[PDB]
């Protein structure tokens, strides 16, 4: 299927987690990935949010950017601000966004709640492009 990745920096659970969502909502339309973890590790916090919603998102882990290839995956989500200098194969690709998105760092549920919530309509917005 088409390719798609998603990039992650401060607590990676928001891009993983778009992922999560893109896994979800992408199955059996798109291959989905994601790359980055800055928080080092997966966050509870956040697989509790998604168990909440019946997803998982502790099964994901740290793979860096530059091990990827975004020349094989036709779509790539960055989430670092858009303002990060990937290199120009990022950019030649079906998709290239960067939903530049909150920050649940340490936060309450409720902002692990949040997040989650406006990231699945940016990725079933980019679902509704491709799939």
């Known amino acids: 299927m088409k390719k798609v990745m998603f990039v992650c920096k401060r607590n990676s659970c928001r891009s993983q987690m778009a992922e999560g969502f893109a896994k979800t909502l992408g199955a059996g339309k798109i291959a989905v990935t994601s790359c980055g973890l800055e928080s080092s590790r997966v966050h509870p916090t956040a697989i509790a949010m998604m168990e909440e919603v019946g997803i998982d998102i502790s099964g994901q882990t740290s793979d860096p950017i530059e ?13 670092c601000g858009c303002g990060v200098n990937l290199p120009p194969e990022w950019v030649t690709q079906e998709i290239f966004e960067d939903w530049q998105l909150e920050d649940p760092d340490g936060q309450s549920l409720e902002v692990f709640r949040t997040v989650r919530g406006q990231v699945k309509e940016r990725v079933e917005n980019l679902i509704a492009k491709i799939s």
Request: aromatic share 16%; no cysteine; hydrophobic share 45%.
């Open 67 to 79: 091990n990827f290839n975004a020349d094989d995956y036709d779509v790539v989500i960055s989430l």
